[PDB]
Each structure stands twice: as C-alpha cells, then as structure tokens.
Amino acid sequence: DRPRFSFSIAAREGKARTGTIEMKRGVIRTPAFMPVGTAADIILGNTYHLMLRPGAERIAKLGGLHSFMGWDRPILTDSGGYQVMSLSSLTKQSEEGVTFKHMLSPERSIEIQHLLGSDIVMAFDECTPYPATPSRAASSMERSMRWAKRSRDAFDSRKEQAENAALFGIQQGSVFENLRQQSADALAEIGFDGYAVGGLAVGEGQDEMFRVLDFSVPMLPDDKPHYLMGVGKPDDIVGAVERGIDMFDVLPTRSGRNGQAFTWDGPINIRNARFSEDLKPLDSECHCAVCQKWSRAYIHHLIRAGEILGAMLMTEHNIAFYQQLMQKIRDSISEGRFSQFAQDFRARYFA
Amino acid sequence: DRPRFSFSIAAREGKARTGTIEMKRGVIRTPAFMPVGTAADIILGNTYHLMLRPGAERIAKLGGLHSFMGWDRPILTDSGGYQVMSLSSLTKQSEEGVTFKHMLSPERSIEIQHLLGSDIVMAFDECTPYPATPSRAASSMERSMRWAKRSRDAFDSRKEQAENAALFGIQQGSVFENLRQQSADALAEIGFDGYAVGGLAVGEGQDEMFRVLDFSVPMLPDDKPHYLMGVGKPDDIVGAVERGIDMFDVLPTRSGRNGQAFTWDGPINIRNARFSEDLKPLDSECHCAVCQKWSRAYIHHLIRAGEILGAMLMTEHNIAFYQQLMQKIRDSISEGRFSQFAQDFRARYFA
Numbered sequence A, B: 001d002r003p004r005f006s007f008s009i010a011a012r013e014g015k016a017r018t019g020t021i022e023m024k025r026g027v028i029r030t031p032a033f034m035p036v037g038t039a040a041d042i043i044l045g046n047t048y049h050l051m052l053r054p055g056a057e058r059i060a061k062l063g064g065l066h067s068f069m070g071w072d073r074p075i076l077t078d079s080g081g082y083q084v085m086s087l088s089s090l091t092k093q094s095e096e097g098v099t100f101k102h103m104l105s106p107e108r109s110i111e112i113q114h115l116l117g118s119d120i121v122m123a124f125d126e127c128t129p130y131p132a133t134p135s136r137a138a139s140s141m142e143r144s145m146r147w148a149k150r151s152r153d154a155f156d157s158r159k160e161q162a163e164n165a166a167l168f169g170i171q172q173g174s175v176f177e178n179l180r181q182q183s184a185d186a187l188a189e190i191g192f193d194g195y196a197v198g199g200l201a202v203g204e205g206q207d208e209m210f211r212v213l214d215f216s217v218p219m220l221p222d223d224k225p226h227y228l229m230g231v232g233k234p235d236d237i238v239g240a241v242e243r244g245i246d247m248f249d250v251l252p253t254r255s256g257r258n259g260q261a262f263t264w265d266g267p268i269n270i271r272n273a274r275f276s277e278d279l280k281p282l283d284s285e286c287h288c289a290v291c292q293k294w295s296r297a298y299i300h301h302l303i304r305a306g307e308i309l310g311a312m313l314m315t316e317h318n319i320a321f322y323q324q325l326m327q328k329i330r331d332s333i334s335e336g337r338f339s340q341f342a343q344d345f346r347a348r349y350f351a
C-alpha cells in the first residue's frame, strides 16, 4: 500500500524538478496542474463554497467529498480564508480567526477540511493584500505563522486526518526577502509535508512575481513539494517551474465558459468572427477529444448560439491543454531539455 | 449499399408499429426519437437558426452539416416556416412564401435544406394557429398543399438531393376530420417518402391532440413512416405510438438546462432542496453514464452552484432516458406487450 505521503525527485534541470508524490489514494506526477473538480492526478475542492452549501457536516453525512463527487483519487482543499476575504460581504479579523457574512479559525478550517475528507490540507493563513508596507506585511506574516502552528496542532489532533492526509504550510511575507525568509524558517521549524508560496497572484504582475519566486522558493525545504497558489497562465507555469515550483491550481475552467481557448500559439477568443469558417481544431497539435473531432467553426457556432455544449467543449479542451503542457514540462525536465522547451514555448506562445 | 429510402415494418400491435428506415447514411429504428444535434439514429438540424447564422451557403462552403457537426449518420431538417412564424419579429405571408425580419418560399426552403445536406427534408408548410375556424383552417391547409407540390418539384429538380435524400409531406387541417382527410389525399396524390402530422402541439392539449390523431393517422399511407411534429413529453410519445406514430422530435434538452430530469416516476426538479442529500441516481433504472456514477445530491449541488457541468449531466441523462423509452417501446411492440407497457408506464409515471 502507498504511504500517507512521500515525495521523490526523479530528475532536475537548474531549479526545475520532476518527480512524484505518493499518497494513499494515488500518485501525483510533478510538476502538476490541479484543476477544479466541478469543471489529472489530483483535483481541487472548493472549501469556501462547500462550507456554505451544503455545509461541511452535510458533506461528511453524504460520505465525504470523494464519494460526493465520484472521484477516488487525491483531492486538495484550500483553508478558506483567501476566499472569505475576497468574496464575503463583511469580514472581521482577529487573532482568533475571521468572522464573516461564521467564524473561520485555524482549528475550524482544519476540521472543515477533515469533514470534507481531502488528502492535501492547507494551513489556515492570511493572504496579505498587495501592495503592503513592510510593517503590515510583517505583522500579517507573523499572524499567519502563529496560525500555521495552530493548524499543525489541530491536524495532528485528528487521528484519521493525521494518519491519512497531508498538511501544507503557506509562506507569506509579501514581496520582502527578509520576511519571506522569516516565514520559511517558521514553517520549517513547525514542519509540514509540503510548502506553498502564498501571497502572490494578487495584482503584482508577472515580473514582480518571478522576482519574489527567485529568492523565495530556495528558502523552502528542497526535499518537499512547492505549491504556488493561484497561478496561473501557461507562461506563469513555465516560469514558475524554472524557479522550482512543483504544483499549480482555475483560468482554464473560467476561460472555457467565456469563449477563450488556450493553444500553443497563445489564447484565442473563439467567438470572434475570424473563426466562423476556420475548419482547423482549436489547437493543431492538441490530442484532446474535442480537437480530434470538431472545428473552431463549429465550436464558434455553438458558443454564439448560447449552447452549453460549446462552453463544455472549450473547457474540456482547456483542461486537456493544461495537462499536455504539464506532461511536456515533466518529459523535458526528465530529458534535460526543459530550458530549450521553455524558450521554444515562449517564442511560439507570444509570436 | 443501403437504398436512398426504405421503410419496413417488422411488427405491429394495434395501431402501433416497429420497424426500420434504411437510408444511405444509416438505419433508423422506429419508433424513433430524434434529438437536436447541438444538444440516436438520426438528429435534427435547426434550419431557421442555420439559415441566419452562418447562413446556408456558408454551411455548404464548410462541407455541409454532417461535416460541420461531426455527425455522419442521418439528419432531419424542418422547412423553417414554423420557426419563422414563432420567433421572427415581423412577418408577411403571401402565396409565394413568408417574408420576415428574408423571403422563405417552398423553393428556397428546399434549396436551404439541400445546402445544409440533410437526409430527411420537410416540405415547406404553414402550421395553422390554434384555435382556427373551419374556414381559416381550410384556406391555410389548401395553401400548404399547393406549397407541398412546389416542395416536391423543387426537391426533384436537384439531382443530388433527389437521389440521396428523402422528402416528407406535412398534413394540416387543424382539428377538423374533413380537412385532415383532404390534406392526406392531396399529399398522397403528390407522393412523399414519409408523412408528418403537422399543426399539433400548438396549444390544444393532450386530449384534443390524441382525438385528432385517432382519425388523422389512419388517413396517411400505412406503408410509409408517420412523424408527429413537435411532440413531446414521454406520455405524449407513448400515446402517439399507440395511435400509429413512428417518429418524434426538444424538451429533454430544454429541460436539462432548466433543472428538470425525466424519470420513470415522472419529472423531477433537481434544484429542489429535497434532493440536496439524495444519494440515489437521477433514475433508479437508467443505464446512462450519469446514473452509473453520480447522485442527485451532486447534480443538485452543481446546478445550484451555477456550474455548466450540472446542466450537461442533466441533458445527457434526459437524452438517454428518451432513448431508453424508445427502446422499451420498440421491444414491447416487437414482443406483443406494448399495450401492457403503456399501462404500466402511465401508472408509474403519474403515481
């Protein structure tokens, strides 16, 4: 039987790594893309949504999220505070947690994720808004580190969870190297199964995000997986892998419902009239079932007609494109040609 | 190679028949349900929509509807006037045809259907509004019969169409037995490959529809297929088969996008809170892939969350339910137990 959690690195090129995470419910090939489940080796559950509808205790009554969704492989859940702060109408923050229109604390977040039955559990953190002053970023990061210890202790108190799931800590510190270092040190002292880079993809832009990754990822333990939260476009993924990221989480699903398809030649808006007579598939190389069978012209027609089928075909293609991207990344690292792949990818994607 | 068109009756029970239509692109088992293609042995194309977007000449440039949609089996198209009269903003009717905000005439309707490349072509008719006085129903039916002859002649003038497609005539006459008889006589004198009962499912209600079918279907040639246009709910289908109908055309697709699932125990609205914890599949006997894998509770969750996936699962189930219904109808007629099936179906569907 597979272990609770075991990360092995099979090959490296620069800071890029490729390998596997073994968990009880399956193996996760890295670098990994983790799509939303309601849209792969692992999918994301939506803690914030589920805790409100139908509620975590109701999901548990129905047998947990794996049974509920019909997915027997690993599931990752976020800790819910990012979404509370982004989407909730009124919020009140304190050392105990966040109250919103409900109190979400480290202990309650871990318990919710336990009731949902997810395999990779995120610590309950605060995603510092951007921009942040050094003082505010430090106070925020310090609270997140106290919450990371509380998250660790709550997870360890639940036997079923401690024995069968894994817990990731989340680095904060905004764009400041010294605070990122303090955060990494605090997380490593507590000890986690994996480490996420939090507080990015919050308006800073790709150049700044990459600059922060340049110094932040090496601060995390090398022998554990690195998860960049909230990222991202295909070019963000490639650049983050070049900087040592192993795991990524939404755009392909959102894009698919809004007319946007990803291709090796960049994104296209299939509703544009230039596709009305285009008999090529969405992407010329894509092996997905949509591209095996249907043209841009027909998908354009369906979306313009308001047919749900059009958006679903777009979404299927986008998810498959992302997984082909991840496979090409894994193969190129394993073959020692990832630097060349990244160069060729960018030249064509942006041409 | 299959013939252009050949209808064979394999078994009968009362007025009900089961058999096959052979056409060049495939065999159609009857009684047949014909779903919309943009949602089976045959699908429906949407003449009215296609003639406006992208236009019939553009569909032909793209290789015809079979290539466009990725469907190599038979396609049926309506003649477009029903939809023009239902949906168009302004219309002007004359002996030549209908002008609307375009002129659609028998000749142009046949040409459009030729450019689309459909296999079963409907004559261009007028669906008389309900209720209609005897005088208005007669004048309308008489115009439709003149248009049926023009449709026949236009179809026969196009070699590719005459040699590879089939043409159905459409009976009109509102609810009046004498006019239905005159219409059937006129259509049989012209000669068609199949015969549709038009002018029903326009607000008259099931009792009146069945009363009209009781006398109208026997007026059509017994040795040719009978297509009831616009029908309908599962109970309408069963009763129409009991009255000699062989072919049916939308509700399962519309219902699937509006929260309604068909089951052997009647329709259910999956958004209702009573399904939020219901672990049973949509239908307890359905063999479709949705019912093999997911619960009412999860489909409820997806639709309530606004996820496109929920509506698509509902639609897949509804289409599959309809096809299981048709298979049970065909099998029960072939086995001589259709009368019993209809009785058992109604008792449970309405319980």
Ligand SMILES: CNc1nc2c(CCc3ccc(C(F)(F)F)cc3)c3[nH]c(N)nc(=O)c3cc2[nH]1
Binding pocket: A036, A044, A045, A046, A047, A078, A079, A080, A081, A082, A083, A122, A125, A126, A127, A128, A170, A197, A198, A199, A200, A201, A202, A229, A230, A231, A249, A250
């Ligand atoms: C978009 N930018 C971004 N997203 C971020 C997220 C949310 C991750 C998430 C949550 C739920 C889903 C769901 F679709 F499955 F619902 C998908 C992804 C973060 N989460 C935490 N905990 N700390 C962070 O510092 C952080 C930074 C993030 N930047």
Ligand SMILES: CNc1nc2c(CCc3ccc(C(F)(F)F)cc3)c3[nH]c(N)nc(=O)c3cc2[nH]1
Binding pocket: B036, B044, B045, B046, B047, B078, B079, B080, B081, B082, B083, B122, B125, B126, B127, B128, B170, B197, B198, B199, B200, B201, B202, B229, B230, B231, B249, B250
């Ligand atoms: C709803 N009631 C109804 N629909 C009727 C229709 C439309 C059939 C049709 C057209 C297009 C589609 C599409 F979904 F594929 F687009 C699907 C079905 C009739 N059509 C003609 N020609 N004469 C009639 O006398 C008649 C009576 C009809 N009663």
Ligand SMILES: [Zn+2]
Binding pocket: A282, A283, A286, A287, A288, A289, A290, A291, A292, A317, A318, A320, A321
């Ligand atoms: Zn594709």
Ligand SMILES: [Zn+2]
Binding pocket: B282, B283, B286, B287, B288, B289, B290, B291, B292, B317, B318, B320, B321
């Ligand atoms: Zn089903």
